[PDB]
Amino acid sequence: MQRGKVKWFNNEKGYGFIEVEGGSDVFVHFTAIQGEGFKTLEEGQAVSFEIVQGNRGPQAANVVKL
Amino acid sequence: MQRGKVKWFNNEKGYGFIEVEGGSDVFVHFTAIQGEGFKTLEEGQAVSFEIVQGNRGPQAANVVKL
16 A cells, blocks of 8 residues: 555545645545445544545545554 | 446455446456445446556446445
8 A cells, every 4th residue: 555644534525635745635535445434534544545546636545544 | 437237256356347338347356345244246236436547557446336
């Protein structure tokens, strides 16, 4: 994967951004989150993930709570 | 976003392909499958998905079983 920290995530809207070292923030949607738990993330949370290119540009995939 | 059908899926390894009417097959990994329950797909199952590009080439995302 790749590593970063959740910059913010709105659990009502179902999206937020992941902050990365030496890079632009990366959009994260709830559908990308891994695990049986409720599909939410919280400010400051450590994650591993993959950057993929969709029709709107870069986005996270395979987002795992560390 | 579009629909297709599962071409095949190797349950042990957790990946397979979705076949698209008039288009190329799309690789699908279990981590893209939405919903609760054991992450798996069955040959012939209709699905909705999006296509993203990662380091390995095009792959499915937001795979929903219809």
